[PDB]
User: Fold this.
Amino acid sequence: QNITEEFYQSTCSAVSKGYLSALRTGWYTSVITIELSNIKEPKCNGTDAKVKLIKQELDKYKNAVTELQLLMQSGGGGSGGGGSRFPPFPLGVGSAIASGVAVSKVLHLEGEVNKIKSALLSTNKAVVSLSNGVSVLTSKVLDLKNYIDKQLLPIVNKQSCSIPPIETVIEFQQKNNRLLEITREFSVNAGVTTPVSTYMLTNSELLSLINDMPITNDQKKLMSNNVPIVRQQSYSIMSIIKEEVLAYVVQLPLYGVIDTPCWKLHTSPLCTTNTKEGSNICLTRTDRGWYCDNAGSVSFFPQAETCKVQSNRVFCDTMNSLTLPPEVNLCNVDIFNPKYDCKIMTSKTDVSSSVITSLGAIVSCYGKTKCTASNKNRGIIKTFSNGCDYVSNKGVDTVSVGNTLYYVNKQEGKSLYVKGEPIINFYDPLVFPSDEFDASISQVNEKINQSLAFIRKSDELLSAIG
Amino acid sequence: QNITEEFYQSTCSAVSKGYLSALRTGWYTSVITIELSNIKEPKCNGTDAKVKLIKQELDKYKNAVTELQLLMQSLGVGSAIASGVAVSKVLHLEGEVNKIKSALLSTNKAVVSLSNGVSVLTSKVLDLKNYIDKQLLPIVNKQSCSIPPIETVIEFQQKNNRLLEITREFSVNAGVTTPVSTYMLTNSELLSLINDMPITNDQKKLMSNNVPIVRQQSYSIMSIIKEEVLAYVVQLPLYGVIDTPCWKLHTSPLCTTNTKEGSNICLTRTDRGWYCDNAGSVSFFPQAETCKVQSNRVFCDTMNSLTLPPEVNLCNVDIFNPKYDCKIMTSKTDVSSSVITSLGAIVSCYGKTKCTASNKNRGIIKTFSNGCDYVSNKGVDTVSVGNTLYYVNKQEGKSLYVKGEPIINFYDPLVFPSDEFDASISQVNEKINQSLAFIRKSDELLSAIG
Amino acid sequence: QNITEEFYQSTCSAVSKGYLSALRTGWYTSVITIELSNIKEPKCNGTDAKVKLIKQELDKYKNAVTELQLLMQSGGGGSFPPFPLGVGSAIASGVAVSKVLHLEGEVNKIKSALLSTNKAVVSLSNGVSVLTSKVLDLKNYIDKQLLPIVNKQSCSIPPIETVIEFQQKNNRLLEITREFSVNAGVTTPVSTYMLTNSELLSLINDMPITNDQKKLMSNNVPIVRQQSYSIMSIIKEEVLAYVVQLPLYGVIDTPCWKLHTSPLCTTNTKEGSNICLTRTDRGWYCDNAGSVSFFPQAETCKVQSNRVFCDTMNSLTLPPEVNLCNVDIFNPKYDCKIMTSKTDVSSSVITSLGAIVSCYGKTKCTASNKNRGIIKTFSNGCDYVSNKGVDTVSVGNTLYYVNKQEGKSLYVKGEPIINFYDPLVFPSDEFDASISQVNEKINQSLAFIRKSDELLSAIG
Assistant:
């Protein structure tokens, strides 16, 4: 690839370029089914150890079915059970599984299970048009019902217990295990699971489902090569168990935006060094996070949690995002530019830290803190002094600030240092607004203008009073 | 249940009513036990395949016992497991292990009163002592290793598995696991425990019907391995508040819409989250991540709650009431966003952003103007703001739009305190009045210089 | 373990002393390997039930190998609080080792290291020298015990013991693959499948630490597992290799103390006409190489007995004089960090051996003993109760349980400093301020009132 990075000395920030987008823009819902045996508790006067084992396994099957019935009588969510942390203040709140739960609700209607049974009578992969009009893919991943009714029931519902061969015991355990594990995952998660396990959907099943999705060939390639990330961004929703059938909705991500350029903004505090003790003013860019070009705008992801990087491919999730004009990138070229009100925040908090970037490290070293960049073999190679500086991952293994040792990413590429005057040095510290939790260049310049003009006016008055 | 929803246009915020409470006020603790074999590494001379398998499984068991021994001893702020830890510290005191042990010699369910006066159900859930001693100790740990049946191999793996899985769960969770897994306590065991608890039949019905949520809000606490017994404490919620009115507050930014650049002021209700009536007060859950909803039933932990006067609800009906000072934030951040409510969607559309509500068949069914607006989930499937597509909840209910003047209009922007990250109506009013007072001091002074 | 506690009425805060540090100062990485058989699909034309079971298990093995192959192509890793806290890269070390392992010829380096032995130090290319372990040899069992049975154009019938034993051996590979597949190749905590308990203990023995540190890690294996990563690296050349990244506790046994804070508001009669002040420096503090390591997110720190396992990457380095904020809040050497508001609601903080209660407004705030009932009804303000005869603390509809840990606590009487502040000069919405910054704003507002009022007074 060409992963590049730029450090701006003027603003104590860095931008990593060269990444390729994979944005989650929508959802694809599918229905997965397991055929279950009707079957009852064994009427079988039996005493052999193999009979005991088969009966124990049939009890595990029966209890799993019971526990899934309990799960179905509260099936999906109440827009779930529960949700993630309230999005940060600017962002919005969504209902992640509203789509899959909408499908799960339809499955609860009477006669729906019968529609699905009669489309999978002959085959394992069929489309069904539900009552509400939506057509869904429907899979049968496991046929217990056949195995128990043909191999097991003939030996347990006589009254006198045909002794099984040990191979039948082992085989029945093998088949029953997936139902058991699906039920465990559902019971401990209130019927909604993420990520989607290999029990909920195997690799072969997921790849077949991906190949049947209404997406492009490039989208199918991207999803197939990145099954782990897809599982990370998927939900399995318990829906129903009736008519000798278990049905759950699997909700796969839909990567509507692909291959658009992304970049990542890292920010560290930029304080004055020239003064001593509590006389220093600090500003810090606040727009850190991921950016991807998206439909003539920029999709901004401020939480480092909603984006997942493999190599140069950035799988972000549009639900946790803002939409901004392209001019936002001017904050990385001309932070005082007129077209965009670049957002900063201020304080007097004069303490040191370091941010590990994609292929480098930003160090904000203030006061008398030990700030150092070192190599496992050759020793210290860069000794920082007061201010905000940067060191590339080339030839550097660790960055040490205070008593904290950071390892840098040996993910390798080319970084460029853009020398420039720190902008904190352009502000008069007497008229500096040093408690802005969120501000902009225009808002801060506005407050400065106001304070200056008041000093102006009151002095004019105090001179005119002789 | 009749879930209802209201959208206050005046304050850009919605309220979902009709839910019913289940608030955890107490803890019930139970002592789960597994009887074990004092066994040692065996002195058999083996070399057979089935013998090798049984030795492997026995060493799995012995390593699990060793792991559990190395475990057993090695808003506000609270600790959720204080009750269970109290019981666990009781069990470490010598003599109590024998108390439970004799209490379960004959039966598998018992009530035991321990030394510091707590009455706890204790339950033997697995007896590896007797299986190992009667089926698996004879053929092993003598001169040379009589052969086992393959049925014995199968059965010993099947039995040792629960101990092994419990040991793993405790191994990665440092001896405290939540939710309580099915290996710690199966569905049958949990239901029996519930039916034997000293609680109302209302609580028995609620807990029995909502086992997964009970697991969500429970704890398995590793306690002891002594006297050939493994004991852990399971800690279950006691929902001392049931069927009281709960309601959910959703909020979104409310901004001026005209006309140019960054010349707008913004204001947002901050009190969003779950509310439930509780002993003549309102329990507020601000981390609405902590409440779990099944149908119309909201399960919350009161330890994650704040307590408010009932007058807090006035903020929904009249944000300028005298009695309660409604908490808001102010800002200038004029960005488009959307909140997916219980059965609708709030959309705050500002600037060039295109905002839409679409049905899966009719295409777009609403195009939002700049400002704060609402849409019901009747005939709406998705809400699209900018590049973000949200699906709306499809739980059904009735949704009422309460027309009103956006209160951000009532504010003169030239004296608007647009920094207030935590404020209220009256704090903003006080700052507005103070700025006006400074203005008027200067103004009447200069009028007087004539 | 002498846990002591002091409550400071003047500042509505409390310090619990008497703890011992265990700080994650660094990382230790090693490479774990499993030997795998190549094996193609068997194609033996037999249909005995045991043959069926063997071929099913081989299919599970084959799909596991394919899932690991996919995870290799993606790679293990291809890569917050505002108090300026740094932004690290947790698995950068292990990912560096994995990156090296991807290169041509490194697999054969480890393979040649591990023919004669099961544990050996390998020198890979980029100046990395890693301890390598071989923890399962599936290639030998498959190629000796299984392959003759099943690759013969007419498969010999296996004994049932072979079916069961193959399931036993294949289990660990299957479980490791399952863990990796739902975590995108990076799992934490490190499970007993990734690294069993005896394996982890041996790896601990072969770390470059003092025997005291080895004892500490081996006695708190659950904490070590919680603080460790397993990074899938490669499957190729009949070898599966994944990197294990263990915490490295370079600082242990130094003094640690925890600071708890609670809002300190004015009790007076009227309204939200109160001023409120709160120390913002809650969290853990540990002496560290002549400085104080500060952990503001007390979330990041585990506590076992009086030992505090913290991670330095969630910490700030502070001068020792920070502790002076616990003695004189107004001392000039260190500038104590506070916050202010008018926000009037009651809360309670459970300390190590007590409870701070900030009871404001018309709230029922009580402290109860389980056998005696309510033993204190808190009056409006900030107060403290010790666990000596106190079991629970109830504020509003919320019931907190007090820590019953044995120790001694000292109530330190003093005048609440919120009373020193004039409620009209008071800067009452400061999200993150200091004593000095509040004094600065108060002086500025006072000066404005002085000038404005005297000015308009002299206009006779």
